[PDB]
Design a binder for this molecule. Structure first.
Ligand SMILES: CCCC[C@H](CN(O)C=O)C(=O)[C@@H](NC(=O)Nc1ccccc1F)C(C)C
Ligand SMILES: [Zn+2]
Length: 185
């Protein structure tokens, strides 16, 4: 079981590296790692389990955040509920296309690897198309808009050594870009 002690902190070199592409099929260990990443998100979102293991609740986790420099992410976004929910373990995900239009969460973003809250808007693409493999090496293409688009971009950023606060304007952190869409969490 992964807990917070498996999550490496900002300043750790692995978070600034570019994660390595996976060979398919995954090793049994790689599959287990990816399953445990998802399980961490599940646990972090369970009130009782999170309290018991001191888990900070998350909707996304990238392998580099557990010091594994491999291009795997897990995303678990519960129903809001429009009836839409996102439960994905992705291998070698790639954004292949996206909207020009940007989106941002009005309170900025947070990160399991970052202890202090960082103020500032993180402008991302409002819509993205991702191609990836799943845990069994099968093909997935996702079309995402708004909040889930933001979450997946945050995760993929980790695979490229990019942290959310890299996107924050230093002079006017809370100024929206013109025509950017405010996304409600
Ligand atoms: C937008 C990218 C955020 C990714 C990070 C994890 N992370 O560090 C990944 O690299 C989170 O998931 C943040 N938590 C939530 O979003 N909590 C939350 C919100 C709605 C429902 C349930 C929830 F738990 C906290 C860790 C700040
Ligand atoms: Zn993060």
């Amino acid at each position: 079981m992964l807990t917070m002690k498996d999550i490496i902190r900002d300043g750790h070199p692995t978070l600034r590296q570019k994660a390595a592409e996976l060979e398919l099929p995954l090793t049994k260990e790689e599959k287990e790692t990816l399953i445990a990443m998802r399980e961490f998100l599940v646990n972090s979102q369970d009130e009782e389990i999170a309290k018991r293991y001191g888990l900070r609740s998350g909707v996304g986790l990238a392998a580099p955040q557990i010091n594994i420099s491999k291009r795997m992410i897990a995303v678990l976004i519960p129903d809001d509920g429009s009836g839409k929910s996102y439960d994905y373990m992705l291998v070698n995900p790639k954004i292949v296309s996206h909207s020009v239009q940007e989106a941002y969460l009005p309170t900025g973003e947070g990160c399991l690897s970052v202890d202090d809250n960082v103020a500032g808007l993180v402008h991302r693409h409002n819509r993205i198309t991702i191609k990836a493999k799943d845990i069994e090496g099968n093909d997935i293409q996702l079309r995402l808009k708004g909040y889930p688009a933001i979450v997946f971009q945050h995760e993929i950023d980790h695979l490229n050594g990019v942290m959310f606060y890299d996107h924050i304007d230093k002079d006017h952190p809370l100024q929206p870009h013109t025509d950017a869409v405010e996304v409600l969490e």
